Every structure is written in structure tokens, then in C-alpha cells.
């Protein structure tokens, strides 16, 4: 029994490698040779929003792109107004430990969860001028690492027990569970169409999941260590990942194989976030050296460096308009660059 | 600015005033962290995530223990770690040593001091006085070690020494370990109190430029 299974798996893996190595006729860096480069860009910090008394672990821009959430380890969530640097709301959490945060696309709800395995949902626009809990979604086994809002009634969550789930908020129980990962799931990214989503774990492999059917579609493996962040090209046909090998990579969907790798000899620290620009040319990245870099996504040549913090950077976010970029840090201060 | 903007600025000021008070009240307590594998009795030292809370001489302590490389970055501002190990099993002592070595040489805990607690010394006494199981079977170097019934003292000194040896191999002098031989013992809070006081004292000496 076992012998046939092992032999069949090995034969299929070899078959898959042989098939995907028949398409790569030309690399990317050989096609975009005659392209005018970007040059040098310089961004000066335009604002700094202070008021937290501990480290910052999460952040998310509003659909309007004028407001934002931020969750700290002191047990409090603050909603800021970027233009006037004013605090619209202050929310105190039941559990001090928190590792994620999200802002609903309409603007009526926020959500958060952490080292207690529960994802709690808060409602913003009510009578009485209060901010009170609506639901407490439970049923996971390990901590939660990331959660993204789908509608005003659906969520997708990634836990630390090697599984992802799709919740319907009103009833309170899961409707779909995605399995097949062998390590903790650290990052989750949605698609602009909201019909597929990609996930990244600690066994150095990312996967492409379907939402309605509920079954894995493709698996990509090109890294040497665990993965800590993931994004999606604005077109919806490519995504960039970042790991503990101090290197980034750009995988493709239709061609099925990796395209390019971004790495420098001087940098050896792991990455903690990643993001694109509105057009898709720049690629931001945040390291543990207390600074961020900017990569030209079609040439792999550095273009600029932002260094306004003292401790490592936890989250990086870009607005829908693309007017500004906000980066969080452990020095309790998150700035806004333009 | 119009009238609405001044009213919104007033609201922001009040929010901030509340945040400051909450911060100071939070700043008046001392937090810890508890670690122990199994068959060690972590819950019987002071007799998703559980937590306790105690006090001694008008100081407030908080404990945290879950039921591990990835969530350990959250606890890098606590004052001290607690590590509870068993002392009657000879089969798994190597596993406890490897676990201690992995915690001591981590990357985010490079300045957090450890407290040890070697449990169940009376079971060690009975198991070594019976003579059925010998330490020389599992540890070869025990035959030559001589102490600096005398048998119980020799054995327990050997077991304590190997942990302290793991501790002093490469620490750089920024943090240290504080062994203990805990039995039904009822004075487990005074010891933690004294060791935390000493930890903060070394910190204050380091800040005032004397060292």
C-alpha cells in the first residue's frame, strides 16, 4: 500500500516539474531590457500620529482613504483622521494581546483578534453614540494571524492551527474550511474580484484558494524559510511574497512559476510586510533594520530608502488613491509619507 | 477653522487625557511568564490563555501561561521568565536541557532574566535512597564528579550544576539565572519578590553609568 503511494507521488511531482519547465523560454529580465529606468525618488515624512503607549501590530486604510485603524498591545484600538491628525474614536479591548485588524469596505464595522483564538466584531454607527460588540466569532484552535472583510456579512480568517475558514456573521458559524497546510498560516490576501485568495504559511509554500468551491487550486514553493507577508498585483494575475531569507519573490498565476527575486548582499534580516503602488511599478518592503526599501518591480534595482523609525517596522499600507503611504513601528509612532 | 472643527479638536483632547491615566495605572503592576513542559506541576507552585494575580508587600504581580517560536515575540518586555522543571524523571532530563538551551539563546529574549524551579526533591530523595535506579546509567560523567545522606546532596548538586553550566557558556553578562530547589513548600512568592527586586536593582545600576 505505502510503496505504491510513495512511488505515485514521486512520479507526479517529476511530471509536474517537467511540464512547467517546458514553458519557460525567456526570462523576465531579458524581455524588459530596453526600458527607461525610474531614477531616484525621495519621500519626506509628512505627518506623525502619536498617542499609543506600546508597540503597534496592525493597520488598515479606509475605503475613503482619509481614515485608518491601528491596534496596539496596550489593549486599545484608535481610529485616526489623517488630514487633521485627530482621534475620531477610542476603543478598549477585553484582551490586551492583539495581532490583527481590519476595516469593513462600507465603513460600519471593524474587527480584531489575537492570542485568544476569538475574532470580535465592533459596530460603529449606532444610536446612543456608543461603540459596542456585535458578534464574537469562535471555533478555532490556535491564535489568529490575519482576517480580511469580504462583505458586511462574510469574513475569511487564518489561524495558527494550519487552517483557514469562511464565516457568515449573522448566524455565527463557519460555512467553509480550507485545509492542506502543514505549518502555521501567517498571511492572507484577497483579490480585486473577491473570488479567489492566496495564503502563506511557515513551511515555505503559498497556495491559491477558491472561495465558493472550497478546494486548493495551485501550490507555489520557492523559498528557504517561512513566509511573513503576501500581496496581489493590481491586475490580479501575480503576487509578491516576503520571507525570513531577506529576499522577495514575484510569482505568476497563468505561467504557474516564479518570475523574479529581489535580494541584496548587505541585507540579511527578514521582511515583515510588502505592498505595491497604484499602477504596479514600485514595490515597498519593510525590514527589521528599522527602515523600509523601495524596489523597481520590473528591473530588481533599488530606488529609494525611508528611515524615520528606531525599532523594527510591523505594518506597511498604501491608500486606494495612492496619494500617501503609512508605516507602523515598535517605537509607538506611525508616520505618513507622500 | 469652522465651528465643527473646534468641537472635534475638543473631543480629541478629552480622548488623550483619558489615555494618559490608563497608561499610568497600567504602569504600576509587574508581569511575569510561566513555562513548563508536562509532568512538572506548573500550577502548584503558588498554591486560550489562563492567568492568575497575586500580591506581596503591596506590589501586584500578573502571571501568563498558554496551553512555540512564533508567538514568543509578544513577550519581550516582561520582567522575568519562570522555568519549572521536574527532578524525579531521569528519562527526559536531556529534553529539558535542550528546551532550556533553546529558550536561553533565543533572539528576542536576549535581555530577559530566568528563574528556575527544580521540583519534587523528596521524590528524588526516595528514588536515590532506594537504589533501584542509578544516575550513572544515564549520565556517564557522574562517576567522576565529587561534591565540592551525602548521596542526596551530591546528586542534586550535579543536577543543578549542569543547568548553570548551560547558563554561563555565553550570556555576555546582561542576564542571569537564579536556581532554586522547590519541594508542599508555601514560600514561593517571597523568593520571586526578592529576585525581581535584585533584577530591577541591576537595571538601575546599569542606567546610572556606574557600570
Amino acid at each position: 500500500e505505502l510503496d505504491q503511494l510513495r512511488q505515485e507521488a514521486e512520479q507526479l511531482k517529476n511530471q509536474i516539474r517537467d511540464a512547467r519547465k517546458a514553458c519557460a523560454d525567456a526570462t523576465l529580465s531579458q524581455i524588459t531590457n530596453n526600458i527607461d529606468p525610474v531614477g531616484r525618488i525621495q519621500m519626506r515624512t509628512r505627518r506623525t500620529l502619536r498617542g499609543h503607549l506600546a508597540k503597534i501590530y496592525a493597520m488598515h486604510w479606509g475605503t475613503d482613504s482619509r481614515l485608518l485603524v491601528s491596534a496596539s498591545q496596550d489593549g486599545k484600538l484608535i481610529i485616526w483622521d489623517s488630514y487633521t491628525t485627530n482621534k475620531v474614536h477610542a476603543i478598549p479591548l477585553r484582551s490586551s494581546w492583539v495581532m490583527t485588524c481590519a476595516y469593513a469596505p462600507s465603513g460600519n464595522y471593524v474587527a480584531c483578534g489575537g492570542l485568544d483564538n476569538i475574532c470580535s466584531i465592533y459596530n460603529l454607527k449606532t444610536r446612543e453614540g456608543n461603540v459596542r460588540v456585535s458578534r464574537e466569532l469562535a471555533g478555532h484552535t490556535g491564535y489568529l494571524s490575519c482576517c480580511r472583510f469580504l462583505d458586511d456579512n462574510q469574513i475569511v480568517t487564518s489561524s495558527g492551527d494550519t487552517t483557514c475558514a469562511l464565516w457568515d456573521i449573522e448566524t455565527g458559524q463557519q460555512t467553509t474550511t480550507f485545509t492542506g497546510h502543514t505549518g502555521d498560516v501567517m498571511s492572507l490576501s484577497l483579490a480585486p474580484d473577491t473570488r479567489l485568495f492566496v495564503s502563506g504559511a511557515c513551511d515555505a509554500s503559498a497556495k491559491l484558494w477558491d472561495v465558493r468551491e472550497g478546494m486548493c487550486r495551485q501550490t507555489f514553493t520557492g523559498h528557504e524559510s517561512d513566509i511573513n507577508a503576501i500581496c496581489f498585483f493590481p491586475n490580479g494575475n501575480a503576487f509578491a511574497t516576503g520571507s525570513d531569507d531577506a529576499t522577495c519573490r514575484l510569482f505568476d498565476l497563468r505561467a504557474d512559476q516564479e518570475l523574479m527575486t529581489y535580494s541584496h548582499d548587505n541585507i540579511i534580516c527578514g521582511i515583515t510586510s510588502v505592498s505595491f503602488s497604484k499602477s504596479g511599478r514600485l514595490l515597498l518592503a519593510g525590514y527589521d533594520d528599522f527602515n523600509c526599501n523601495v524596489w523597481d518591480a520590473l528591473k530588481a534595482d533599488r530606488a529609494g530608502v525611508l528611515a524615520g523609525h528606531d525599532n523594527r517596522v510591523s505594518c506597511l499600507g498604501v491608500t486606494d488613491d495612492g496619494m500617501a503611504v503609512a508605516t507602523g513601528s515598535w517605537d509607538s509612532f506611525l508616520k505618513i509619507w507622500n | 477653522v469652522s465651528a465643527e472643527d473646534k468641537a472635534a479638536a475638543e473631543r480629541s483632547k478629552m480622548i488623550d487625557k483619558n489615555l494618559r491615566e490608563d497608561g499610568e495605572k497600567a504602569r504600576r503592576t509587574l508581569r511575569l511568564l510561566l513555562l513548563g513542559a508536562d509532568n512538572s506541576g506548573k500550577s502548584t507552585i503558588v498554591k486560550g490563555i489562563f492567568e492568575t494575580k497575586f500580591q506581596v508587600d503591596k506590589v501586584n504581580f500578573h502571571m501568563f501561561d498558554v496551553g512555540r517560536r512564533k508567538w514568543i515575540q509578544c513577550f519581550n518586555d516582561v520582567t522575568a521568565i519562570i522555568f519549572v522543571v521536574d527532578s524525579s524523571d531521569y528519562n527526559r532530563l536531556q529534553e529539558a536541557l535542550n528546551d532550556f538551551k533553546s529558550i536561553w539563546n533565543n533572539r528576542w529574549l536576549r535581555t530577559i532574566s530566568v528563574i528556575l524551579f527544580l521540583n519534587k526533591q523528596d521524590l528524588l530523595a526516595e528514588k536515590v535512597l532506594a537504589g533501584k535506579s542509578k544516575i550513572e546509567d544515564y549520565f556517564p560523567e557522574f562517576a567522576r564528579y565529587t561534591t565540592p545522606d551525602p548521596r542526596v546532596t551530591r546528586a542534586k548538586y550535579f543536577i543543578r550544576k549542569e543547568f548553570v553550566d548551560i547558563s554561563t557558556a555565553s550570556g555576555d553578562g546582561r542576564h542571569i539565572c537564579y536556581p532554586h530547589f522547590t519541594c508542599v513548600d508555601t514560600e514561593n512568592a517571597r523568593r520571586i519578590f526578592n529576585d525581581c527586586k535584585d533584577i530591577i536593582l541591576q537595571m538601575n545600576l546599569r542606567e546610572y553609568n556606574l557600570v
Epitope: 481614515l67 475620531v88 446612543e128 453614540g129 | 465643527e4 468641537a7 475638543e10
Partner: single-chain antibody, 230 residues
Framework: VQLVESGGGLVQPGGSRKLSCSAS????????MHWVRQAPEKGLEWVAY????????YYADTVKGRFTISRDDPKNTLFLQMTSLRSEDTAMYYC??????????????WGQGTTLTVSSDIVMTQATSSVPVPGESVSISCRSS???????????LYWFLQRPGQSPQLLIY???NLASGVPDRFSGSGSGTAFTLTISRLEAEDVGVYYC?????????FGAGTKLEL
């Protein structure tokens, strides 16, 4: 939410009276109270405003120096103290609550009024007083003394509709947005110094008086008002 006002009655001239309002079902501390009085043959006129936490106090020129406003957070009550009364103070006083933050809507709830009978400025005027009109669209226009459009791009104009023998309710805030619990048929359009309110598919119980109020700067001044009849 419930707002209740206790006080009023016949008072001799030069007498001192106290009006107490108690609010329940919402957080009193966050909101900032307002005082509005309506004359028997005249439109609503602003009287006094108290900021949340008692940080800022503003008074009308007419009642300045003889009226004191105070509030107690624990008792959840609002008090107005009047001294040295005159003959032209016979009116009805309504308790109003407003909260200020980005995207918030002020003057959402109006408390029940009481009766008290004794024994420069932006000028906003509406040309139409009475309009005769179901199933036919109606248009109401309110003129302004000066442009209400600020540097930020926000124009402050408020439309209030009062049914016969009932407290007025907010319909449109900032001349575009629609208040919660209000039907979609009502619409608001505007330009600097000219504002028009258009209602379509008019039905029964929509008859009432409409007032345009500018919140650009203190003191707030209400419009003359327009009366709708079948």
C-alpha cells in the same frame, strides 16, 4: 432615547424660574446640549449652547448676562436659570442634543417643549410663505446673506420639518446628506448663496413648515419658514 423637560407656567415680570431637562437611554456625557425657544407668532430662535464637559459656553445677545446654563453628568440633567424676566420672553423651550466628530450629524433629536408665559449676523430669508399642493413635486428655496462654502469644501445648511402640534425633526444635513429614518424621495441640491429643497411623489402627512438653518458661525440664525397646505 427620551428627553423630558419640567418647568414653566405663569410668572410675574422680574421673577426668577429654573428649567430642568432629564435625558435617558443614551450616554449624556458624550453629547453637547443646546437650548432653542419658539415664539407663538414667530419662527424658532437659538438661545444658548453648553459644550461637552462644560469646556465652552455661548449665549445669545438678547439673553446675554441674565441666563445661566449648567449640567450634571451623574444626575443626567440639564438646567437653565433665568432671572429678571421681561414681557417678550413668553415662549416654548425645546432641549436639543448635538455630537461633533468627522462624518457625524448634529441636532438629530429634539426633546418635548414646555410653555413659559409672563404677565455681523448672517441673514437668511425665504420668499415663499405658503405653497398650495399629492403626486406633485414641490420646490423650496432659501436665500443666504453671504456664501456658506468654507475653504475645506463643506457647506453648512440644515433643513428641519415640523408637523402640526409636533417637535421639528432633521431632514437634510450639509445640504446633501439624508438623516437616518428619512425616506429617499426627499432630495437636496445647492450652490453658494442659493439653496433649493426638492421633494417628489408627495403623499399625505408630509404637510408642515420647513426652516433653513446655517451652522457656519455663532449665533445660529433660523429662516422665516415656508407653510405647505393641501
Amino acid at each position: 432615547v427620551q428627553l423630558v423637560e419640567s418647568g414653566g407656567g405663569l410668572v410675574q415680570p422680574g421673577g426668577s424660574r429654573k428649567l430642568s431637562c432629564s435625558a435617558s437611554g443614551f450616554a449624556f456625557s458624550s453629547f453637547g446640549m443646546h437650548w432653542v425657544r419658539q415664539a407663538p407668532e414667530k419662527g424658532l430662535e437659538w438661545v444658548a449652547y453648553i459644550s461637552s464637559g462644560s469646556g465652552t459656553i455661548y449665549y445669545a445677545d438678547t439673553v446675554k448676562g441674565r441666563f445661566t446654563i449648567s449640567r450634571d453628568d451623574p444626575k443626567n440633567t440639564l438646567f437653565l436659570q433665568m432671572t429678571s424676566l421681561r414681557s417678550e420672553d413668553t415662549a416654548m423651550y425645546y432641549c436639543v442634543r448635538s455630537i461633533y466628530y468627522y462624518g457625524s450629524s448634529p441636532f438629530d433629536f429634539w426633546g418635548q417643549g414646555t410653555t413659559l408665559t409672563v404677565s455681523s449676523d448672517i441673514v437668511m430669508t425665504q420668499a415663499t410663505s405658503s405653497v398650495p399642493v399629492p403626486g406633485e413635486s414641490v420646490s423650496i428655496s432659501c436665500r443666504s446673506s453671504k456664501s456658506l462654502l468654507h475653504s475645506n469644501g463643506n457647506t453648512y445648511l440644515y433643513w428641519f420639518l415640523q408637523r402640526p402640534g409636533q417637535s421639528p425633526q432633521l431632514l437634510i444635513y450639509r445640504m446633501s446628506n439624508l438623516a437616518s429614518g428619512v425616506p429617499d424621495r426627499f432630495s437636496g441640491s445647492g450652490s453658494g448663496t442659493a439653496f433649493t429643497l426638492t421633494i417628489s411623489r408627495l403623499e399625505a402627512e408630509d404637510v408642515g413648515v420647513y426652516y433653513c438653518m446655517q451652522h457656519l458661525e455663532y449665533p445660529l440664525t433660523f429662516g422665516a419658514g415656508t407653510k405647505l397646505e393641501l
